[PDB]
Design a protein around this ligand. Structure first.
Ligand SMILES: [Mn+2]
Ligand SMILES: [Mn+2]
Length: 648
């Protein structure tokens, strides 16, 4: 919840690589650091090429589609009911229909009989990887089958043509159902000698974001293309839904405003509505359908809020596993209620309603593995490490509870990490830093928005209402935050926050939105320590007592006070106490380091003459000062190595 949150400072890269990214991407050291951690090291990683990924089975499926089209075979597109499944079938349904195909959708074994009666070619989107037995249409009545999906497969690929990323050896890419739908239509356009179907990238991007797929490589390229096309979409329904939610080109708006609206239709039993919104060219009908989705989303929200309100206060504590029963709960909203409970609790969550079950888990507790430990009690079940689902007779709930509660007790408590890119730059460099981080977008599963660490005594603190909302300043920068129940900041605070560009009344303000705030505590990070920060007062005392000490040539003023006081001056490689920094590395040491307060070495504190790699130096300096002051042997030692190098 709060005592199991670990803050860590990301490691510094080798200076030669840091400088290469800076030069190659034309950015300062802060953004360069972020790029490096995300794997962006060439100008080609920021704008990857949107190309036809060579998935296994893709050429064949496209060949089969050409045959279906030319011979006028009846194509049925069977997609999933969430955003990815719906955008994926809309892509294939619109795509194939534009080429003169006789095609129609079918939205979700007892169905196979009519699946047979209605089609010559059966296309599953975002599903069908594990539906073996239904090889019936392949067998029972000669129906051609194409499976496109990306979900966790089975022990063996199902009958029929199967196109799946995970079945493509080597391939690092992780396209989703809509991504695969999109690649397939593209493969077909290639066979027909037609241009890439880029007008379908917006639908594809919506599905990819909705499925929380990693946003790097091809997925990153697909999303930049689709996000950009939404405003003037070829699909009036998508455009109108984007406008209804005030879309401004952000992947985050799709993830939190557009897709949930599409998903609500499904969860509430009206998935046809969302699909039709994506297939219509009639603006009037689309407008009405957006209204309808807004109504379904409001209903889903109302039900989710009521359920959360009934559940969260229950069996939560420090239980190891939260397992609750709500007999009459709506199964269409419980997945999200379990996610929200998991977050306010850092515990796997298991919910059961109307005989249906959903699991959201984290840390070392595999969701599906907990269910496997109680499998005898279940009618159906399955999922992965983070989410899972099942069906079970509610009479068995108490037995199910103990089973999972004990499964979870086998593991150490889940712990949440907060990753910090670096210390926040000085107020004057925030605009440039913000503009350079800009290029990282779109943010998502692939690349999270970076967080900066602020530290100090809060000043000018002032509340906003009677709630936790409040604002203050740290060394000149305004930070906005929701004080976790308490209000009133301690004397000194540590903040993990997002660099924001806040527009108001035609003007901009560069501030920080705190994601976490807390009393200064141990920070994870740094290298195997060799230099240990010691306050100058303590160091001078020991020096006066006769400890073998080192004072660098620089600030002969300090070297004078030393000589002209009889210190047992020594060279850095043999003195276990240093009062300043040596010019070149001195490892295989294990020494205690002091800078000062009125000391000259403490001049990692003076402002530069920006722009070049002068900013690389200033970041290193600010790092040393911070690690020195926090008495953090690991970050100090790491900063000291970077310090030697940016001076060679
Ligand atoms: Mn799906
Ligand atoms: Mn999917």
């Amino acid at each position: 919840m709060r005592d199991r949150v670990r803050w860590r400072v990301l490691s510094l890269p080798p200076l030669a690589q840091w400088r290469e990214v800076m030069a190659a991407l034309e950015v300062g050291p802060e953004a360069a650091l972020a790029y490096w951690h995300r794997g962006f090291r060439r100008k080609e990683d920021l704008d990857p090429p949107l190309a036809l990924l060579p998935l296994k089975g893709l050429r064949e499926a496209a060949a089969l589609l050409e045959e279906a089209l030319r011979q006028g075979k009846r194509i049925r597109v069977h997609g999933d009911y969430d955003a990815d499944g719906l955008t994926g079938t809309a892509i294939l349904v619109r795509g194939l229909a534009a080429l003169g195909a006789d095609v129609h959708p079918f939205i979700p074994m007892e169905r196979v009989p009519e699946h047979l009666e209605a089609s010559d070619l059966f296309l599953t989107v975002d599903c069908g990887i594990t539906n073996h037995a239904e090889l019936r249409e392949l067998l029972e009545n000669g129906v051609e089958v194409i499976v496109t999906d990306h979900h966790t497969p089975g022990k063996t690929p199902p009958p029929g043509l199967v196109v799946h990323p995970a079945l493509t050896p080597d391939l690092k890419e992780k396209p989703t159902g809509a991504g695969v739908a999109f690649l397939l239509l593209w493969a077909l356009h290639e066979r027909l000698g037609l241009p890439p179907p880029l007008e379908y990238a917006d639908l594809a991007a919506v599905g990819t974001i909705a499925d929380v797929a990693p946003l790097w490589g091809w997925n990153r390229a697909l999303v930049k293309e689709g996000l950009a096309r939404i405003p003037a979409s070829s699909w009036v329904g998508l455009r109108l839904l984007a406008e209804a939610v005030g879309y401004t080109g952000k992947a985050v708006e799709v993830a939190f405003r557009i897709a949930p609206r599409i998903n609500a239709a499904s969860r509430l039993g009206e998935a046809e509505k969302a699909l039709r919104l994506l297939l219509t060219d009639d603006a009037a009908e689309a407008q009405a359908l957006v209204g309808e989705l807004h109504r379904l989303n409001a209903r889903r929200q109302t039900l989710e809020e009521a359920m959360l309100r009934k559940l969260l206060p229950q069996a939560d504590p420090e239980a190891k596993a939260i397992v609750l029963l709500d007999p009459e709960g709506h199964p269409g909203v419980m997945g999200i209620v379990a996610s929200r409970i998991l977050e306010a609790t850092l515990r796997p969550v298991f919910l059961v309603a109307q005989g249906k079950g959903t699991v959201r888990s984290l840390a070392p507790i595999s969701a599906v593995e907990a269910l496997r430990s109680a499998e005898d009690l279940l009618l159906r079940y399955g999922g992965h490490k983070e989410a899972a689902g099942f069906a079970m007779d509610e009479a068995l709930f108490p037995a199910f509870k103990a089973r999972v509660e004990a499964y979870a007790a086998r593991f150490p408590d889940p712990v949440r990490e907060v990753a910090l890119l670096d210390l926040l730059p000085e107020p004057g460099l925030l605009p440039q830093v913000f503009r350079e981080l800009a290029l990282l977008e779109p943010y998502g599963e692939g690349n999270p928005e970076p967080l900066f660490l602020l530290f100090g005594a809060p000043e000018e603190a002032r509340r906003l209402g009677e709630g936790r909302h409040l604002a203050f300043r740290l060394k000149g920068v305004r930070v906005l935050a929701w004080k976790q129940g308490d209000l009133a900041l301690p004397p000194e605070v540590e903040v993990a926050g997002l660099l924001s560009e806040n527009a108001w009344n035609g003007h901009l303000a560069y501030e920080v939105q705190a994601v976490d705030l807390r009393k200064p505590e141990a920070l994870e990070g740094g290298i195997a320590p060799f230099a240990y920060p010691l306050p100058l007062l303590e160091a001078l005392a020991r020096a006066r007592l006769g400890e073998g000490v080192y004072v660098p040539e620089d600030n002969p003023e300090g070297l004078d006070y030393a000589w002209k006081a009889g210190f047992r001056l020594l060279p850095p490689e043999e003195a276990g106490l240093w009062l300043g920094l040596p010019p070149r590395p001195v490892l295989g040491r294990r020494v205690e380091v002091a800078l000062g307060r009125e000391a000259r070495a403490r001049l990692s504190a003076p402002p530069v003459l920006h722009t070049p790699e002068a900013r690389l130096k200033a970041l290193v300096h600010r790092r040393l000062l911070f690690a020195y002051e926090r008495r953090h042997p690991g970050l100090f030692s790491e900063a000291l190595l970077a310090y030697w190098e940016v001076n060679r």
